[model samples]
Target: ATFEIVNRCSYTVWAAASKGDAALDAGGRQLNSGESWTINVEPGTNGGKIWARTDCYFDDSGSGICKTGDCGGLLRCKRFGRPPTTLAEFSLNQYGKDYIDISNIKGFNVPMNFSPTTRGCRGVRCAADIVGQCPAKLKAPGGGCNDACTVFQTSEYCCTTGKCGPTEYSRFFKRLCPDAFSYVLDKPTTVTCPGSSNYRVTFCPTA
Candidate 1:
């Protein structure tokens, strides 16, 4: 009969093992969080032991091993890979309630396990104008100035202009702007003025 193995752990699992006198160890396979797999079992095999496996990478040498319990933090098992050991055997005659429940198995813990705070775009950068320095001068009253620069050490700096020109600003902008910016306005003003057009810069507040 065909059986399904589900992953219920916070992290992904690499493989699973079966228990019994001759139970097989399904050389642990890799399973991503919330992922599942199916397998076929034959009759006459004893159902004894069962456990999940994980793949973890090691930083010391980059080599890894497949074992029970939590593997190292860096070494990770391949997701969805099958275990090297065989699965436990079940008998059709006694199969009334003799099936194995591999769904509840807790796979190994990987430090890189999925976390809610782990953003899909974590390392991304955005472009923003530097603060204080304005790019385009205001043309009319109530015009906007480039006030992207925020106060630092009681001194004002341009987010787009100032000492950091467009090129330098662009380079630094790319690194800071994880989302990129088109144009930013400095503090709002009533009269048109030079160095008034504002720009924004990317910044990681928490980083």
Candidate 2:
């Protein structure tokens, strides 16, 4: 499968990918508004994520910190990022099917759309103005909206015990984007499709 990452935001975003053995785009790429990059998905990859980092400044050596979604201070992320960011998560060729989902489980930074480009499967998006409408209690520093788990860090919100339900905060996210994963125990937002289909993940997606 192929995955294309596109940035439609007015500002620049540094795209990052993780969990696939062969790092997509060496795990990061700078995408100014209207730019995009394509990645060849590795076979049998699992738990892969594509995300964007905002308000970043990197030197020629690719060393920097992003206001949101910083991963070890490297322009090419070495690992998964800090929270308060939108994510496109996928697992390829797992049991003859591919699973894809958009998540605000950690929080919401940019609006996102994750969709299959082939196979006629439905697309999922979280394009709500989450940062602008963020509740004060769940707001992150600088910008972006924080999840209840990230701000409270309690079992009730984090689902650390593997048993929990939606809270007011989780509901807030769910109400805005019902198809995106809002909490750790959020129900079936995942889309299952045939393994060979190509996909796209867009930032700041429009209707």
How high is the CA lDDT of each candidate model? 0.29, 0.88
TM-scores for the candidates: 0.30, 0.96
- For model 2, the stretches where C-alpha displacement exceeds 4 angstroms are 20-22
Summarize candidate 1's per-residue lDDT along 2-85 as a digit string, tens digits.
335455545655534343223233423466766655544354334432334444443464346544332232133222222221
* Candidate 1: Cα lDDT at 200: 13
lDDT of 2 by residue, 26-47 (tens): 7899999999889887867788
lDDT of 1 at 31: 66
The TM-score leader among the candidates is: 2
Query: For this target, which candidate reaches the highest lDDT against the unseen true structure?
Result: 2
Clashing pairs for predicted structure model 2, backbone only: none
When summed lDDT is taken over every stretch of 10 residues in candidate 1, the lowest stretch is: 107-116
Per candidate, the number of residue pairs that clash is 68, 0
